[PDB]
Amino acid sequence: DLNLNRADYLQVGVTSQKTMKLLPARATQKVVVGDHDGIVMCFGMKKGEAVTVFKTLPGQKIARLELGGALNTPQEKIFIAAGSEIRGFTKRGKQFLSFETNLTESIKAMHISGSDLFLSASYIYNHYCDCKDQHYYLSGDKINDVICLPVERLLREVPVLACQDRVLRVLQGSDVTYEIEVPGPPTVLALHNGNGGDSGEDLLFGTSDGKLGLIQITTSKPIHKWEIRNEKKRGGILCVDSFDIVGDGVKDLLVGRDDGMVEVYGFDNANEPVLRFDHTLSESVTSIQGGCVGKDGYDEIVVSTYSGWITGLTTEPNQEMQNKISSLRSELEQLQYKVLQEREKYQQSSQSSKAKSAVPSFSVNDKFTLNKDDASYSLILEVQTAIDNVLIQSDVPIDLLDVDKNSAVVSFSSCDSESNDNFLLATYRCQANTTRLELKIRSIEGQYGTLQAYVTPRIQPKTCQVRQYHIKPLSLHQRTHFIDHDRPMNTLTLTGQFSFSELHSWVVFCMPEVPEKPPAGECVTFYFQNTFLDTQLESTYRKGEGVFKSDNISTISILKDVLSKEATKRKINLNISYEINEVSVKHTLKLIHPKLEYQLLLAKKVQLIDALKELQVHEGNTNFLIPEYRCILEEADHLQEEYKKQPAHLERLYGMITDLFIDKFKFKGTNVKTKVPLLLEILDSYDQNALIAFFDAA
């Protein structure tokens, strides 16, 4: 067991991903951090207190910060990359590098191997050999990070490259060598040792839902050593590092989730990891390192969070709390007086007509992702300050399910949906000092639209920042690498006078995880999968036509509706044809059946749990009741907590079956809106064979 007690160091501004580093300068190492405000500051703990070793005047947003040396020399040269350039300082703060490396938009990743440089972008990827343009690539998908294997323990120069579509594109030079599959979008990857493993080269990637792996990439084939698949600790892997805290001696893995969890893994198994320390930090722990920053001799973790609180968890365990709080009493006196002064000044300036009120802009770190285990999006807002309240306005039938880790209080306004478009208006208050706000959103299969979120912080000049998210039409699908070709695929082919950009933008507007940049090649195939019930949506389309083969039937209908709607939004006059297999609807019904059966069984069990408890309280339930109910007694708690959600599953399944019926008979040609209520009582009875007979007969 590990008990690394907490301690705090100097707080810096809001920081990006892996923007903190430990310069080794066995004495205390020295920390260096970036900031969205252009400041890049290096400091250290002397005798328990911080000392500003140096600091740079604010420029642009420090998106990445690595440390490397020109030769295999001790890597002390600190390289940052703010807007589109790369600045490079020595360990004492004297600048020695300023590379313009003019890109299009910005820089979101970088890796330095000696002097070799690998800098990524939204889609662009570049490799330089001492500022000399050497290799270039334009991946069709967003890039999350870039790594290069150790060109010393290994011979060649093979840079890995993490793409946002769950593929590791191992490339050499300026062309892709091969691909690796990864479950979840890889956001961080690093060599899992100070060199990269004793066995040549060893990669260690982390995904966005929380998962890690050890893909050992050979010359032409990647081998999966093993993988950590999170069991209860969902969250975005933002940062990883290798360091030996436990006394085993070889090395350990430190990982920082997005919700705040800080996990440590050891390899006593010699193959498999084991968790040692699971601790939360209530923010986005954006950078992790291991070592010693104060009180040398003891190992510790240094973690930079989102708000810039560079904290540490040490191995060694009154008269200090009062001291810090008295220093803070002096600080609060002086600062409160100063800010009330110009508060009154700003109020004095609030009567002039020529004057114009500026705005205190702030940064929010939203994350609108789709959970696969459930069918519910998980919106995660974050502000450096404390949130005063968050508004949630929608245009879609949406189920804001309340989460447990949250502490805010909700107030569902009486939305109209007739005089205005607000199908949903909610308000979270967070009557505390809260930085992040995690909340669920359960969407329906066929409805789509915008979803605004008005975030207000606790800054004295009050401002609200609106952030818009999109609930796609097919917002319950997600991209996969392959589909089964034997299942009944109800295909749909559309042809018209549209260009490739038009059809691609339509598919993006309809499909969740398609990149907006029109792919080069003019013939593109995306394989999807419905996350509620497994029905693929293989979509292959060119400049002139599009084919959408899908196990499900209703997905074809939604695709047809939304694509026709967009075409008429641009007046393209497309032609659409469809081919429907007769066994596909029966297959979808065979898929839906087990869930309805389970829900109804759970309902009929919770009908009896109460009386059964009423009887066991008297008799004791070991001598009179037949165990067909003793099982119910033992499972009572699960039965209750799942009946808490049973009716939502019932309503979703009923609406889905209704829409499936409607769309089946719509492709057959007729409208059945009259007999739509006629199937409801059948579902309430729910004989499977009678249900299929209802489907195929009337």
């Binding site: 067991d1 008990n3 006593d268 084991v274």
Partner: protein, 486 residues
């Protein structure tokens, strides 16, 4: 009141014994945890449970049932974090950091499957806790294995005249070790150095439920609910009786006091003993306690953990501040003994006359009962009584018939029922009687049914008689209860 109850849990399942209940800081940083290798409810799910403070945190699954789980030391120079050695069949599992670390097995000597049944450790050189401790084990195959303190070499095999049940050890390995093995055959054996035969046996008279080794004398708890203090030599010193059944015992200790007594769990929900001079170990409990462990738990040096019968968990912290009824004769007695002293002859004569009349009337009634065969007990040795069971319009009339003789059956018998054929409906009035084996009670059932639409009772006679003859061997009468029917 001399204990501070830290936790007395009532409805958590913990079924372990004081041998498989050991306490140590198997992880380090000077804070003591409690390991308990238990079988669960029964022999289904043995899971090593670790307790830290008040609530469980981890249960490691085990392959089979842990016969023991002992904690020793494994570093004489600069002791490290000690590991836990549990036992299961031929396997011994060493758990460092409470993680599965190492496994050793018994040497298979002619598959033939062996089992370890008890473990106990013994010091090496200085007789302190900072030194290392050599292991001792007992097997179902009649062996006792003294092993190196780290269990990688067999150091001393020993033969036992019977299968062991409990172990204890005293002394130092090289100087002298005394291995008290309390066996199942109703005896103990003290094994010493260089024994081709254990050479030391001691009788108790039954199988022992436990044992405790104080500095000089040894203690044994008898299955017959007593405590007997012997000496290592072989001579019984003292005996004491317990007011309940001894469930389990252990070795209490308190180094700040010097009191080292026995914690005897009893079936009357109590721990009780009489020490040499002071009256200690007197503690009650809601449910009978089955396993005990006095040790330093968490941070305090005088914790006492207990596991009771129906699961549960008890934690007690010990505070450092440790003529005859001869009746009365009233005036009536003296007045009547006076009237008897004056006129005793009249009383005597009238009592003799009344007794002659009584003998006459009793002989008269007895001859009448013989005449009418009304006796249910009267060669031809038989006995019959009848029982009516039921309150409705139907009664189970069961006849208990018994042949009361040394050895001879009664072949020819029949039972007839004489009843009112209007009020009662018996399906079989007449039926034969089986061969009455002498000494056995034969219950013969019948179903009477009250036919009276009102509540009207009546008698029912039962005649037991031989087939050939026509005079009832005996008779029984049954006053049939009220109908209470419709």
């Amino acid at each position: 009141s001399k204990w501070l109850d830290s936790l007395s849990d009532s409805m958590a399942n913990i079924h372990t014994f004081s041998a498989c209940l050991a306490l140590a800081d198997f992880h380090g940083d000077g804070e003591y945890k409690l390991a308990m290798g238990d079988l669960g409810p029964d022999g289904r799910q043995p899971r090593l449970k670790v307790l830290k403070g008040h609530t469980l945190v981890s249960q490691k699954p085990l392959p089979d049932l842990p016969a023991a789980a002992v904690t020793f030391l494994m570093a004489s120079h600069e002791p490290r974090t000690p590991a836990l050695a549990i036992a299961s069949g031929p396997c011994v599992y060493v758990y460092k950091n409470l993680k599965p670390y190492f496994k050793f097995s018994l040497p298979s000597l002619p598959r033939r499957q062996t089992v370890i049944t008890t473990m106990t450790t013994l010091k090496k050189n200085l007789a302190d806790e900072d030194a290392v401790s050599c292991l001792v084990l007992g097997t179902e195959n009649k062996e006792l294995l003294v092993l190196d303190p780290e269990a990688f070499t067999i150091l001393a095999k020993m033969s036992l005249p019977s299968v062991p049940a409990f172990l204890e050890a005293s002394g130092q390995f090289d100087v002298e070790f005394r291995l008290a093995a309390a066996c199942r055959n109703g005896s103990i054996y003290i094994l010493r150095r260089d024994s081709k035969r254990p050479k030391y046996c001691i009788e108790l008279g039954a199988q022992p439920v436990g044992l405790v080794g104080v500095h000089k004398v040894l203690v044994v708890g008898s299955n017959q609910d007593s405590l007997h203090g012997f000496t290592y030599k072989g001579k019984r010193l003292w005996t004491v009786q317990m007011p309940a059944a001894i469930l389990a015992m252990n070795l209490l200790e308190q180094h700040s006091r010097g009191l080292q007594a026995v914690m005897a769990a009893l079936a009357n929900e109590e721990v009780r003993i009489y020490h040499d001079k002071v009256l200690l170990n007197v503690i009650r409990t809601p449910e009978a306690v089955t396993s005990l462990c006095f040790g330093r738990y968490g941070r305090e040096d005088n914790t006492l953990i207990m596991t009771t019968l129906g699961g549960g968990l008890i934690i007690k912290i010990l505070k450092r501040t440790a003529k005859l009824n001869v009746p009365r004769k009233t005036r009536l007695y003296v007045d009547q003994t006076l009237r008897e002293r004056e006129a005793g002859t009249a009383m005597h004569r009238t009592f003799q006359a009344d007794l002659y009349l009584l003998r006459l009337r009793a002989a008269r009634a007895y001859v009448q009962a013989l005449e009418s065969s009304l006796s249910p007990v009267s060669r031809e040795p038989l006995k019959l009584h009848a029982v009516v069971q039921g309150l409705g319009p139907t009664f189970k009339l069961t006849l208990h018939l018994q042949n009361t003789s040394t050895a001879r059956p009664i072949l020819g018998l029949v039972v007839c029922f004489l009843y009112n054929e209007v009020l009662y409906a018996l399906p079989r009035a007449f039926f034969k009687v089986p061969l009455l084996v002498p000494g056995l009670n034969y219950p013969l059932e019948t179903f009477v049914k009250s036919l009276s639409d009102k509540g009207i009772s009546d008698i029912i006679k039962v005649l037991v008689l031989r087939e050939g003859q026509s005079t009832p061997l005996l008779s029984a009468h049954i006053n049939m209860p009220m109908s209470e029917g419709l």
